[PDB]
Design a protein around this ligand. Structure first.
Ligand SMILES: O=C(Cc1ccccc1)N1CCC(c2nc(-c3cccs3)no2)CC1
Ligand SMILES: O=C(Cc1ccccc1)N1CCC(c2nc(-c3cccs3)no2)CC1
Lengths: 194, 194
């Protein structure tokens, strides 16, 4: 039941490391999970549904880690504050590269995946803008661009840049340089008078 | 011949405004171009080949405009220099939204389109890094991040941000705000000591 469903999810995540979702059959998933094909269909309507659940788990894990960070005070310089925040996403998605990659690809073909990604991007943009606004209210950051517009561009940069790095795309920032790269761009753009 | 090929390309660009390439038949393209289906196949092997040519034309048009800008001196403040450069791409791709949209989608399914996009991104990143390097050599910009890494993140931000704006994605920066938004992030990140 719960353990049969988890075994399907774990199998799917494992197989996605080696091949595209298109190259993975419902048969592969059932076999990996130690169940029959008809039993698989009790837990999931399709392999696409399995990917959606995997993506949902990872995105919620990132979101929850951001929430935990946000709850703490927690005495730090402004650059370190943003670095710790971006790190939540670097570590969470970077620890689930196969799911990250497959989930991004599915945005083109699945309305559910597209909606899921959109929902969480809006949430993360809103939180970013709220923190920028707080920084401005404090006198710590200058009142330059509309905070929400600035937040949107910075979050879209993170999406494209982190994911190109994880996929080893040509061009991409090396994974070992991408955190410092994004942090510099966030800090200078949020705190820079010009 | 040359005019038959141009009519196919123009027809394809027109139909892409209204529907996905998948919703456009070779029949539609031939009919729009005033030719038969077998005659279409003389000029192009597939509708995918038509999209590749459309994308190639637009990307080269942007690249050539950047070259022209780069040839001039041409007495300006640093913010305006970068604004004029980003504007080349905003105007070129923004004047061909349907081709831009379809070309980006085809990156997932066409190695030729993927390679084309990669080639020009590497070129634009290299040019960006060269200009940053020149600015540093001048004493105009500080020696912060590796120029090529900074250039890569800024160009990936432009790709994701411009194209989300043109597509009206949720989330996206409004098209009427995206130029100012990207310029601020470029200027602060290139010239900001922190
Ligand atoms: O990188 C992201 C989100 C993202 C990750 C991957 C792909 C697209 C978007 N963020 C969103 C939230 C942003 C943020 N951090 C914080 C805080 C950090 C520390 C205390 S609050 N507030 O907003 C950090 C960077
Ligand atoms: O926006 C882009 C490229 C791009 C556009 C869309 C999608 C992805 C990438 N660029 C690349 C070149 C960059 C640049 N401008 C210049 C100069 C401007 C004026 C004189 S040189 N040098 O590099 C401007 C911004």
């Amino acid at each position: 039941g719960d353990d049969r469903e988890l075994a399907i999810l774990a199998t799917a995540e494992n197989l996605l490391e080696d091949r595209p979702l298109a190259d993975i059959s419902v048969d592969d998933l059932a076999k990996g999970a130690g169940i029959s094909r008809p039993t698989f269909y009790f837990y999931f309507p399709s392999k696409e549904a399995v990917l959606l659940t995997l993506l949902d788990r990872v995105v919620n894990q990132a979101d929850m880690a951001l929430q935990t960070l946000a709850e703490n005070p927690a005495d730090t310089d402004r650059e370190n504050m943003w670095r710790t925040g971006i790190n939540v996403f670097f570590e969470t998605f970077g620890s689930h590269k196969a799911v990250t990659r497959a989930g991004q690809a599915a945005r083109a073909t699945s309305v559910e995946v597209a909606e899921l990604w959109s929902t969480f991007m809006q949430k993360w943009i809103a939180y970013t803008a709220a923190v920028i606004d707080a920084e401005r209210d404090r006198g710590a950051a200058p009142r330059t661009l509309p905070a929400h517009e600035l937040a949107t561009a910075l979050n879209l940069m993170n999406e494209r840049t982190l994911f190109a790095s994880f996929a080893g795309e040509q061009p991409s920032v090396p994974e070992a340089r991408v955190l410092d790269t994004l942090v510099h761009i966030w800090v200078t753009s949020i705190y820079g008078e010009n």
